[PDB]
């Protein structure tokens, strides 16, 4: 009757495991982090690539591991390395962290729904 909307239910918090499968061009996401490794955090989805096709990652997910290999620390070097050296199929553990996300990107904050919203 009224409509359901996904956009007024949590987004789940909790850490979350994701297969990603090799495109001919990469994973079709891209991080930020720091020299200091404060995080890593997907900061655009490819639409059509790997990671959208999975359909179980978004912008302001923290990649916590790649096939084991604990990314919790590492710059956005060290993590790009992991990603390029993990294969054709990806394991990431992954966690959405909205707040420490928006600390990155510019004019961004978070809204009552926890979701990431630019001026």
């Known amino acids: 009757g009224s409509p359901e909307f996904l956009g007024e239910e949590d987004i789940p918090r909790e850490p979350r495991r994701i297969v990603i499968h090799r495109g001919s061009t990469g994973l079709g996401f891209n991080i930020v982090g720091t020299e200091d490794g404060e995080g890593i955090f997907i900061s655009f989805i490819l639409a059509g690539g790997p990671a959208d096709l999975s359909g179980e990652l978004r912008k302001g997910d923290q990649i916590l ?27 990431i553990i992954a966690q959405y962290k909205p707040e420490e996300y928006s600390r990155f990107e510019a004019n961004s904050r978070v809204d009552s729904s926890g979701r990431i919203v630019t001026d």
């Not at 084991?68 to 990603?83: H, M, P």
């Open 65 to 91: 591991s790649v096939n084991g290999v604990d990314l919790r620390n590492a710059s956005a070097e060290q993590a790009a390395i992991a990603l390029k050296n993990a294969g054709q199929t990806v394991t």
